[PDB]
């Protein structure tokens, strides 16, 4: 299933992938977070790792 808790450095790529290309594209996001798939991807940003 889904691997380890999330990392400073794993939350780091999906906030500058986000700042990127922008909220949604949770396929393109989870192409680049090898380790978390885009429903992960997702929840992470929507739940507590909402900045933007």
């Given at each position: 299933?889904?691997?380890?808790?999330?990392?400073?450095?794993?939350?780091?790529?999906?906030?500058?992938?986000?700042?990127?290309?922008?909220?949604?594209?949770?396929?393109?996001?989870?192409?680049?977070?090898?380790g978390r798939i885009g429903k992960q991807?997702?929840?992470?940003?929507?739940?507590?790792?909402?900045?933007?």
């Open positions: 299933l889904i691997k380890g808790p999330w990392t400073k450095e794993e939350d780091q790529r999906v906030i500058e992938l986000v700042q990127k290309y922008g909220p949604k594209r949770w396929s393109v996001i989870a192409k680049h977070l090898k991807c997702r929840e992470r940003w929507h739940n507590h790792l909402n900045p933007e």
